[PDB]
């Protein structure tokens, strides 16, 4: 069909920053996570390397995708697909050439795929403040992120869903640890510590004559993978403006819905969640200045000069959003 042909053509840009992820979601019948993960697994030869039966991979991916909520505007399967594809591009950075093993690459991509699964569209702080069952279960720390992991791993146990069935026990143990370490690091309360440690690495950076990063121990390797997926998670402002604006519309819709719940419960409305007292453009400029740019400028220093085009786009978008403020 024409739809399947245009989808295949759009997926040819899977190695590019700025993939038309929304168009892919439309063309695939709302299966962007499944089609993008499958495409990436084939591109990186991951099915052959880890002896993953294709039917098992597709069954797991469709199941995983089904557990992202279609009525959550931002934290859904499209966001997951976007973070997966963004991580995939970051893994191909010239400065990281042949740095990570196939198992580490698998861990980073898998972590990206499950990183927000079963997200309810409300923040950790909302869950803590409302005395939710999730916050009770997880003792108020990385409430959502612990839950995303638990769901992502539990789904491997469904019928014909264990994509890691042919890995050795050691490979499985290592992958599981890496995935947990990466997803727990997506908790925004850990952003400042992650960045501080990334800065320390940049200052003590070691490279070959070609600028390829030399990372020997687990601590340094997982730290780079944690920051990589965190960057991918916070990559919306670094994408072509047309895409970024759509992401902004989506997070604002989600935030406003949380604010509506807070208002009717008589709670203080969280920052950026009050639809009656919002400043969307000022908030984006603040998000870039205080969080996104500091992180991306540091990442850019680590892999200099490979991320220059990403940083240039971020600054272009910041300039545009600022121009919309009278
Ligand atoms: C597209 C613009 O995005 C946002 O403005 C934000 C904010 C302010 N926080 N935020 C989150 C990032 C990671 C995890 C939860 C929220 C996003 C996407
Ligand atoms: Mg998250
Ligand atoms: Zn996310």
XYZ file of C-alpha atoms and ligand atoms in Angstrom:
346
model
C 0.000 0.000 0.000
C 0.984 3.661 -0.443
C 0.880 4.122 3.344
C 3.411 1.311 3.888
C 5.657 2.797 1.159
C 5.664 6.317 2.610
C 6.301 4.842 6.077
C 9.361 2.971 4.760
C 10.617 6.218 3.176
C 10.184 8.204 6.404
C 12.060 5.455 8.296
C 15.071 5.963 5.976
C 15.857 9.028 8.162
C 16.173 6.880 11.318
C 19.865 7.841 11.641
C 19.055 11.579 11.479
C 18.322 14.158 14.172
C 14.874 15.517 13.384
C 13.152 12.336 12.183
C 9.446 13.018 11.459
C 8.296 10.940 14.465
C 4.722 12.309 14.448
C 4.291 11.424 10.764
C 5.624 7.922 11.494
C 3.096 7.543 14.333
C 0.275 8.422 11.918
C 1.497 6.194 9.070
C 2.020 3.170 11.346
C -1.460 3.187 12.927
C -0.082 4.600 16.172
C 2.816 2.122 16.379
C 5.862 4.464 16.265
C 7.621 2.628 19.116
C 7.253 -0.788 17.474
C 8.301 0.276 13.963
C 11.164 2.528 15.111
C 12.573 -0.081 17.523
C 12.326 -2.805 14.861
C 14.020 -0.568 12.293
C 16.834 0.295 14.737
C 17.304 -3.354 15.787
C 17.679 -4.327 12.110
C 20.025 -1.381 11.377
C 22.322 -2.327 14.286
C 22.068 -6.069 13.508
C 20.811 -6.680 17.077
C 18.483 -9.594 16.195
C 21.348 -11.652 14.754
C 23.868 -10.651 17.428
C 21.583 -11.637 20.330
C 19.605 -14.351 18.513
C 16.315 -12.523 19.060
C 13.494 -14.210 17.104
C 11.764 -11.521 15.034
C 8.270 -12.652 16.104
C 9.344 -12.376 19.771
C 10.694 -8.842 19.292
C 7.500 -7.654 17.594
C 5.275 -9.309 20.210
C 7.213 -7.644 23.050
C 7.271 -4.240 21.353
C 3.529 -4.191 20.630
C 2.845 -5.252 24.219
C 5.207 -2.586 25.595
C 3.646 0.047 23.341
C 0.147 -0.987 24.516
C 1.224 -0.080 28.063
C 1.894 3.561 27.139
C -1.346 5.527 27.601
C -3.009 6.833 24.429
C -4.841 9.550 26.417
C -1.655 11.060 27.944
C -0.593 13.936 25.657
C 3.173 13.898 26.182
C 4.321 10.816 28.141
C 3.115 8.297 25.567
C 4.421 5.889 22.921
C 5.428 8.759 20.614
C 7.740 10.178 23.303
C 9.187 6.721 23.927
C 9.813 6.264 20.174
C 11.439 9.701 20.055
C 13.761 8.983 23.011
C 14.724 5.600 21.487
C 15.584 7.191 18.120
C 17.407 10.091 19.775
C 19.515 7.675 21.831
C 20.195 5.710 18.651
C 21.579 8.833 16.951
C 23.652 9.788 20.025
C 25.171 6.282 20.117
C 26.510 6.898 16.564
C 28.420 10.062 17.635
C 31.962 9.908 16.102
C 33.513 10.518 19.555
C 31.805 7.340 20.806
C 32.883 5.190 17.832
C 33.367 1.597 19.016
C 33.289 2.738 22.661
C 30.237 0.734 23.738
C 29.682 -3.011 23.343
C 26.652 -4.498 21.618
C 25.227 -5.361 25.083
C 25.615 -1.753 26.294
C 24.038 -0.462 23.058
C 21.157 -2.905 23.615
C 20.779 -1.737 27.219
C 20.685 1.948 26.249
C 18.091 1.419 23.510
C 15.931 -0.931 25.601
C 16.070 1.480 28.566
C 14.942 4.297 26.254
C 12.032 2.186 25.030
C 10.674 1.381 28.493
C 11.718 4.574 30.280
C 8.228 6.100 30.694
C 5.981 3.030 30.282
C 2.578 3.210 32.028
C 3.102 6.935 32.790
C -0.175 8.327 34.262
C 0.446 11.912 33.083
C 1.215 13.349 36.528
C 4.539 14.088 38.219
C 6.353 12.328 41.059
C 5.585 15.264 43.357
C 1.859 15.029 42.530
C 1.932 11.301 43.337
C 3.685 12.017 46.658
C 1.357 14.898 47.566
C -1.816 12.905 46.842
C -0.678 9.968 48.998
C -0.892 7.689 45.945
C -0.404 3.929 45.985
C 2.649 4.375 43.722
C 4.366 6.746 46.178
C 3.448 4.391 49.042
C 4.957 1.449 47.161
C 8.190 3.281 46.320
C 8.734 5.303 49.508
C 8.587 8.646 47.686
C 11.829 8.137 45.722
C 11.975 7.846 41.932
C 8.336 6.749 42.181
C 7.530 6.807 38.464
C 10.955 5.675 37.293
C 10.891 2.570 39.516
C 7.422 1.797 38.154
C 8.489 2.228 34.471
C 11.293 -0.289 35.067
C 9.076 -2.798 36.876
C 6.512 -2.746 34.042
C 9.124 -2.879 31.258
C 10.791 -5.946 32.764
C 7.573 -7.677 33.852
C 6.282 -7.597 30.249
C 9.220 -9.791 29.125
C 7.422 -12.635 30.973
C 4.295 -12.471 28.771
C 3.798 -15.158 26.087
C 6.562 -14.999 23.455
C 7.901 -11.683 24.815
C 11.338 -12.619 26.226
C 13.589 -10.922 23.695
C 16.584 -11.753 25.939
C 15.929 -15.535 26.000
C 19.171 -16.335 24.134
C 21.475 -14.126 26.227
C 23.734 -15.848 28.764
C 22.813 -15.465 32.442
C 25.758 -13.057 32.861
C 24.604 -10.988 29.882
C 21.079 -10.856 31.347
C 22.345 -9.797 34.788
C 24.574 -7.086 33.282
C 21.865 -5.755 30.944
C 19.311 -5.608 33.772
C 21.681 -3.652 36.031
C 22.537 -1.205 33.243
C 18.882 -0.656 32.327
C 17.921 0.045 35.959
C 20.874 2.448 36.355
C 19.875 4.330 33.193
C 16.115 4.650 33.805
C 16.567 5.651 37.460
C 18.805 8.472 36.142
C 15.881 9.923 34.103
C 14.278 11.065 37.394
C 14.501 14.869 37.078
C 15.321 15.272 40.785
C 18.723 13.742 39.919
C 19.430 16.173 37.039
C 21.733 18.501 39.017
C 23.919 15.666 40.385
C 24.135 13.930 36.970
C 25.234 17.163 35.307
C 27.779 17.944 38.024
C 29.348 14.504 37.516
C 29.252 14.902 33.710
C 31.138 18.194 34.094
C 33.769 16.461 36.253
C 34.235 13.833 33.520
C 34.628 16.495 30.817
C 37.368 18.162 32.892
C 39.271 14.869 33.364
C 38.386 13.666 29.827
C 40.737 11.185 28.073
C 40.717 10.643 24.283
C 42.647 9.077 21.394
C 44.336 11.187 18.692
C 40.996 11.095 16.777
C 38.968 12.410 19.739
C 37.356 9.094 20.672
C 36.419 8.826 24.361
C 38.339 6.308 26.469
C 36.065 4.822 29.160
C 37.456 1.803 31.005
C 35.451 1.123 34.183
C 31.755 0.621 34.719
C 31.302 3.840 36.699
C 32.429 6.027 33.798
C 30.689 3.973 31.090
C 27.301 3.892 32.812
C 27.630 7.596 33.647
C 27.949 8.456 29.953
C 25.000 6.168 29.102
C 22.908 7.743 31.890
C 23.636 11.252 30.618
C 23.093 10.141 26.998
C 19.561 8.877 27.633
C 18.879 11.896 29.888
C 19.938 14.164 26.976
C 17.641 12.190 24.635
C 14.798 12.600 27.144
C 15.525 16.372 27.166
C 16.104 16.653 23.410
C 12.821 18.299 22.315
C 14.233 21.883 22.322
C 17.186 20.743 20.151
C 14.960 19.412 17.336
C 13.650 21.337 14.323
C 11.241 24.012 15.582
C 8.188 22.388 13.947
C 8.764 19.276 16.081
C 9.723 21.151 19.274
C 6.544 23.271 19.136
C 4.435 20.102 18.913
C 6.230 18.671 21.960
C 5.625 21.932 23.837
C 1.900 21.824 23.023
C 1.779 18.258 24.316
C 3.600 18.772 27.627
C 1.548 21.905 28.321
C -1.687 19.951 27.747
C -0.487 17.245 30.146
C 0.684 19.776 32.757
C -2.584 21.743 32.533
C -4.555 18.539 33.165
C -2.471 17.882 36.294
C -3.126 21.471 37.374
C -6.863 20.916 36.868
C -6.688 17.942 39.235
C -4.685 19.980 41.771
C -7.179 22.870 41.622
C -10.235 20.678 42.252
C -8.426 18.937 45.143
C -7.598 22.343 46.675
C -3.848 21.875 46.250
C -1.296 24.496 45.256
C -1.005 24.329 41.455
C 2.470 23.166 40.371
C 4.728 25.354 38.200
C 3.550 25.517 34.539
C 0.307 23.640 35.376
C -2.133 26.562 35.757
C -3.916 27.134 32.422
C -5.339 30.433 33.789
C -1.917 31.863 34.819
C 0.497 30.403 32.252
C 3.416 31.934 30.361
C 4.305 29.158 27.892
C 7.008 31.026 25.993
C 8.762 32.415 29.081
C 8.671 28.900 30.567
C 10.366 27.401 27.485
C 13.118 30.028 27.566
C 13.574 29.276 31.279
C 13.602 25.512 30.638
C 16.357 26.005 28.046
C 18.457 28.468 30.066
C 18.369 26.622 33.379
C 18.156 22.924 32.396
C 18.432 21.982 28.717
C 21.266 24.262 27.548
C 23.578 23.602 30.546
C 23.160 19.851 29.959
C 23.612 19.975 26.154
C 26.585 22.372 26.293
C 28.289 19.929 28.668
C 27.441 16.936 26.445
C 28.806 18.942 23.487
C 32.072 19.492 25.380
C 32.370 15.725 26.024
C 31.985 14.827 22.321
C 33.341 18.074 20.797
C 32.677 18.990 18.057
C 30.114 16.296 17.114
C 27.115 17.881 18.853
C 27.622 21.386 17.415
C 24.653 21.133 15.016
C 22.382 20.040 17.904
C 23.571 22.921 20.079
C 23.117 25.364 17.179
C 19.500 24.254 16.767
C 18.870 24.601 20.514
C 20.172 28.185 20.469
C 18.115 28.974 17.306
C 14.960 27.724 19.029
C 15.702 29.641 22.232
C 16.106 32.817 20.148
C 12.768 32.165 18.436
C 10.819 31.482 21.634
C 12.342 34.630 23.188
C 11.200 36.640 20.163
C 7.577 35.576 20.865
C 7.783 37.364 24.256
C 6.796 41.052 23.826
C 8.768 20.336 25.216
C 8.991 21.222 26.426
O 9.188 20.387 27.580
C 9.009 20.876 28.820
O 8.900 22.056 29.011
C 9.336 19.997 29.958
C 9.463 20.459 31.355
C 9.488 21.868 31.886
N 9.805 19.403 32.046
N 9.750 18.233 31.228
C 10.004 16.934 31.706
C 11.157 16.265 31.280
C 11.444 14.979 31.763
C 10.578 14.375 32.680
C 9.428 15.054 33.118
C 9.143 16.343 32.640
C 9.475 18.649 29.953
C 9.350 17.717 28.775
Mg 10.261 9.921 32.888
Zn 10.712 10.716 29.283
